[PDB]
Amino acid sequence: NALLRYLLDK
Amino acid sequence: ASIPHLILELLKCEPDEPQVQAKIMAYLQQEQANRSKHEKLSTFGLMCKMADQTLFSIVEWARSSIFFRELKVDDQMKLLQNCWSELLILDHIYRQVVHGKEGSIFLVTGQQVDYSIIASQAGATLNNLMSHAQELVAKLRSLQFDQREFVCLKFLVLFSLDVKNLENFQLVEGVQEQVNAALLDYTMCNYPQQTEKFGQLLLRLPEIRAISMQAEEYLYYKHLNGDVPYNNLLIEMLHAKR
Numbered sequence: 001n002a003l004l005r006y007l008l009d010k
Numbered sequence: 011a012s013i014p015h016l017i018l019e020l021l022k023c024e025p026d027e028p029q030v031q032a033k034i035m036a037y038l039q040q041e042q043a044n045r046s047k048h049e050k051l052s053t054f055g056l057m058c059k060m061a062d063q064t065l066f067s068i069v070e071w072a073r074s075s076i077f078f079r080e081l082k083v084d085d086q087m088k089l090l091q092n093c094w095s096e097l098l099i100l101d102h103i104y105r106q107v108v109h110g111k112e113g114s115i116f117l118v119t120g121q122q123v124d125y126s127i128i129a130s131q132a133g134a135t136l137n138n139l140m141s142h143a144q145e146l147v148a149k150l151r152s153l154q155f156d157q158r159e160f161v162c163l164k165f166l167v168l169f170s171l172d173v174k175n176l177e178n179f180q181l182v183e184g185v186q187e188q189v190n191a192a193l194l195d196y197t198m199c200n201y202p203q204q205t206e207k208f209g210q211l212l213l214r215l216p217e218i219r220a221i222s223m224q225a226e227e228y229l230y231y232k233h234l235n236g237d238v239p240y241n242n243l244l245i246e247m248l249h250a251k252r
């Protein structure tokens with residue numbers, strides 16, 4: 001999973 | 011009306027419902043408008059999108075929590091991938107207890123639909139879960155389930171003790187204790203009528219958890235069968251770790 005990480009990693 | 015300072019800090023992470031309702035329905039309306047009536051979305055396709063938007067609210071809500079931001083993204087992703095379905099069901103239940111009336115269903119957009127109308131369009135699995143949720147919605151209304159206790163259950167759901175492989179589990183443990191303590195004191199203090207409200211409050215979490223499981227699996231399968239329209243993060247939510 002990479003999309004969720006983008007939302008948190010922001 | 012006594013409110014522990016801890017509970018006060020939790021309520022500050024709640025978004026402004028009146029606007030997010032406008033955000034969601036203003037979003038759904040444009041989607042349908044951009045399509046001819048061969049393209050228009052089914053009732054299921056629409057329900058899928060409201061949940062996705064609700065998740066965007068949930069993530070932004072979780073990101074607003076100070077305790078959550080103290081974790082690295084790794085631990086953060088593990089807690090959300092374990093409670094995202096239970097939080098969605100919880101938020102829906104609380105929406106009925108607040109704005110809902112028996113025989114009617116209230117959506118995140120604030121739309122009030124008849125239960126019979128929506129139920130007659132769902133399979134046997136969804137009907138059993140929907141009604142089972144209705145049963146919980148009724149029990150909570152009798153207990154005078156308030157907003158202060160609603161936010162507590164959210165954090166209790168978010169910071170699960172059953173989450174394994176966490177870098178900072180001790181942080182999750184302290185939050186679990188602090189929230190359980192604050193809720194008990196507030197419940198017994200502001201609701202001496204129900205001497206047992208708190209003891210019964212915790213009882214519903216496993217029941218809301220079970221519903222979350224059966225629903226999450228159902229959608230994972232429908233997505234595998236292609237019956238689930240693409241809704242961005244909601245897909246990867248089930249697309250990853252079931």
Ligand SMILES: C=C(c1ccccc1)[C@@]12CC[C@@H](O)[C@@H]1CC(CCCCCCCCCOP(=O)(O)OCC[N+](C)(C)C)=C2c1ccccc1
Nearest residue numbers: 053054057058060061098102128131132133136139140143
């Ligand atoms: C998880 C949900 C969801 C998400 C996406 C779709 C359906 C449901 C929510 C949670 C908050 C709301 O935001 C959602 C919304 C709702 C309620 C709306 C239910 C929609 C009814 C009609 C949808 C048809 C689904 O289609 P089907 O049941 O698979 O069967 C039809 C085809 N066939 C297989 C029989 C041939 C939810 C809910 C569900 C169970 C318990 C508590 C809350």
